[PDB]
Design an enzyme around this catalytic site. Structure first.
Site, mmCIF file in Angstrom:
data_model
loop_
_atom_site.group_PDB
_atom_site.id
_atom_site.type_symbol
_atom_site.label_atom_id
_atom_site.label_comp_id
_atom_site.label_asym_id
_atom_site.label_seq_id
_atom_site.Cartn_x
_atom_site.Cartn_y
_atom_site.Cartn_z
ATOM 1 N N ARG B 51 0.266 -1.067 -0.267
ATOM 2 C CA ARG B 51 0.000 -0.056 -0.300
ATOM 3 C C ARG B 51 0.838 0.927 0.082
ATOM 4 N NH1 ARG B 51 -5.528 -0.517 -1.773
ATOM 5 N NH2 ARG B 51 -5.943 -2.388 -1.116
ATOM 6 N N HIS B 120 -11.671 0.447 6.851
ATOM 7 C CA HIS B 120 -10.505 1.588 7.032
ATOM 8 C C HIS B 120 -10.288 2.449 6.776
ATOM 9 C CE1 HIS B 120 -11.205 0.461 2.770
ATOM 10 N NE2 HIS B 120 -10.484 1.673 2.192
HETATM 11 CA CA LIG Z 1 -9.713 3.634 -0.520
HETATM 12 FE FE LIG Z 2 -6.572 3.068 -2.539
#
Ligand SMILES: [Ca+2]
Ligand SMILES: [Fe+3]
Ligand SMILES: [Ca+2]
Ligand SMILES: [Fe+3]
EC number: 3.1.5.-
Lengths: 456, 436
Positions: B51, B120
């Site tokens: 990420r 999230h």
């Molecule tokens: Ca997102």
């Molecule tokens: Fe994203």
């Protein structure tokens, strides 16, 4: 049928069931947690690839080459058993890699244990034997026409070389070209080097100009000085040059990055400070250090990149000194580059003398005395080798070509001459007085060691 | 002067010194150890990206779009401080992702704590606040012309949304188009999706047909029903449909992979059996569980993919049950795929009733009696969740759910049993008849 894997460099990859049985193994899946470049990931965000996909590509390319030569020259007597043996050798050539790949065997082991001569290829052979032993691979080899007694010796010889006149025992001399595919010692050009040329370029945003699939289509086995060698078509010298340039661009821009190599030394420094307090359980419950885990494959299987995070997330006060260095990486409070030098015309520095280098720089005698007395604990000496096991030579001189008219005999007979070893020095102090003093020690050590004069 | 990054997708990208201060942070470097695709790595070898690289791309694309709009339209009064705020917003939109990305908040948390509501994005804003405070970033923000009161609210709002009339506090309605860049909640076309469309295609070997660059070049802001919205040029709709196909291809071939989702459920199951024994250190020595690490942000900062390996390399007998499942991932002894279905009505299964699903399947009574009786633990049910874009004229520049059931038993008899249970369970839930 058999498994298909969608690789972003090679496309569709077909996996023989024997290869699948070797892959579905903790010793091979271990490579999912081994960074290909290590510290380079913290400089190049795309460099997130691990040894797992590299090994899958090397095995694919090794099978592609050996299958092309067999279908193009039936007189070579290449068997399907030989194809699978070369594929396994390509799959398992990097089994012995440790945390952050070349940082482990290139710097950490020499610093923690300078007495032992250890390479990741030695570990590949030990991990391969532990792999086949722990997963009953031998009966699966017999299933598919392999003879483990000599084929396993053939695979090991492809990975590490001869195991101490024709010196190989896995295959007779009339198949010497099979020993030139996975890891060529004559010129260094091999399918293993081809895979990460394309993979690293794909992950760093550097352009690859070597068409490796075109090179396979024109590769032929030829007789050169009474030796069977894999030769290239003469019309592939332009592709060959593009391959050399692509390796230099990767070395000049990525492998020798000044910040990426600093981070490697910081991770090595944290590992060294933590080596006395981490425990890896081996066979029989025996506790092993990070440095001694190479003596036990049961423990080495559990030694991956997460030991970085184990140290970073540790609460033990014994590991605080190592934890602080890793915290410094997250804050970009890195070691300070003092300078760079090079042993041109000098004997290259060896791994067993790495541990003595920072004490040698701190012992230098600059003429201008300063109020800052520096100790060896404030110096980091980084040795960057483009190939530790190599001597300065042009690889084209060991490349043989063939003509369309004489496809069995070689030809009697701009390239960038490349530096081999670079010596960089970093300081752990961050104050300008010590940082300037360390620069004075370093330029004094460069005249004593008879190295090139530092410029900046 | 600013730092330069070589990225495989966008090339050389420049980072404002404020952005760099935010990046050089354990709260943000935590993203280096979070697989973007999670279980998809164990099916696609090239999908090793995390990420961290994706957040950098989103932060770059968001700044490119805002800068392109300001340069191409000096009437919007887009200041350099407005550009930085959008850059930080895209840079920090995914700060709240847990181990293996969406399988943490999409499966694991609903299974371990079915009572708590957690996303999230709602965790990304908590991560952002903790990041700002723990590193003294507010003075650095001010020294680059950013006023923390309005800006922190702005960045939070273009991530999670507003916390009848204009509900945003960080910017007035005159700059409404700024809220449509990092995450659009109207049609769902943002720079976030642009980044991981190209980035996932680049790592999976899937052909990416969208060109986000020529889209950004011809993108302008227009007036739609007395409101300012991001609109594209009339002849760039071919890029829009290539975007939609690349999305469909990525979901069909990658995000909805059979084995890939099975691996995700197997990782969830090992996490569930390791939840009661793994200790995460938090605020001032306190200890949290993997399911409870979301309550403390300092404990969440240390919750990454490393949990997978601390379970694998463990020697604790209490962790043996979880260690077994992870080892079966290495040996490729996976759960068998039983069936797949979808709801017939518009109703969609929420997360508060995920753990009730396997027992429902086991409580079904097939019309024909058989030999093997199946428990609830032997079933795995995971839930897979998935024309309205403004345009302008060149002359006048203005104006759903999928359900898959798996079996942990992998013999002929138990698999025939599981199919009979799954078909019967689909029948009295009024779901689509499973394809044979
Ligand atoms: Ca997102
Ligand atoms: Fe994203
Ligand atoms: Ca190697
Ligand atoms: Fe290799």
């Amino acid at each position: 049928t058999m498994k298909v894997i969608n690789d972003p460099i090679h496309g569709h990859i077909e996996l023989h069931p024997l290869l699948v049985r070797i892959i579905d193994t903790p010793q091979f899946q271990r490579l999912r947690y081994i960074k290909q470049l290590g510290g380079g990931y913290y400089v190049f965000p795309g460099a997130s690839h691990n040894r797992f996909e590299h090994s899958l590509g090397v095995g694919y390319l090794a099978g592609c080459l050996v299958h092309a030569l067999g279908e193009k020259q039936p007189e070579l007597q290449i068997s399907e058993r030989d194809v699978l043996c070369v594929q396994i050798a390509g799959l398992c050539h990097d089994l012995g890699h440790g945390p952050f790949s070349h940082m482990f065997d290139g710097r950490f082991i020499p610093l923690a244990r300078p007495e032992v001569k250890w390479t990741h290829e030695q570990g590949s052979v030990m991990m391969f034997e532990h792999l086949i032993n722990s997963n009953g691979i031998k009966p699966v080899m017999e299933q598919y026409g392999l003879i483990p007694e000599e084929d396993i010796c053939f695979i090991k010889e492809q990975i590490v070389g001869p195991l101490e006149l024709w010196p190989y025992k896995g295959r007779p001399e009339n198949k010497s070209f099979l020993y030139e595919i996975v890891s060529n010692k004559r010129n260094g050009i091999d399918v293993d080097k081809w895979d990460y040329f394309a993979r690293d370029c794909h992950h760093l945003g550097i352009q690859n100009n070597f068409d490796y699939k075109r090179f396979i289509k024109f590769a032929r086995v030829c007789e050169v000085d009474n030796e069977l060698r894999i030769c290239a078509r003469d019309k592939e010298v332009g592709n060959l040059y593009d391959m050399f340039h692509t390796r230099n661009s990767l070395h000049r821009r990525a492998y020798q990055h000044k910040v990426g190599n600093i981070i490697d030394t910081m991770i090595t420094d944290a590992f060294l400070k933590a080596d006395d307090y981490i425990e890896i359980t081996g066979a029989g419950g025996k506790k092993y250090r990070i440095s001694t885990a190479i003596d036990d494959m049961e423990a080495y299987t559990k030694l991956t990149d997460n030991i970085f995070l184990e140290i970073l997330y540790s609460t033990d006060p014994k590991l605080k000194d190592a934890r602080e260095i890793l915290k410094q990486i997250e804050y970009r409070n890195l070691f300070k580059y003092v300078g760079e030098t090079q042993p041109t015309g000098q004997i290259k520095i060896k791994r067993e003398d790495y541990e003595s280098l920072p004490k040698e720089v701190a012992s230098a005698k600059p003429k201008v005395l300063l109020d800052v007395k520096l100790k060896a604990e404030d110096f980091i000496v980084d040795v960057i080798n483009m190939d530790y096991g190599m001597q300065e030579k042009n690889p084209i001189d060991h490349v043989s070509f063939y003509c369309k008219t004489a496809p069995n005999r070689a030809i009697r007979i701009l390239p960038e001459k490349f530096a081999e070893q670079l010596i960089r020095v970093y300081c752990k102090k961050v104050d300008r007085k010590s940082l300037y003093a360390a620069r004075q020690y370093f330029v004094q050590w460069c005249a004593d060691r008879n190295f090139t004069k530092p410029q900046d």
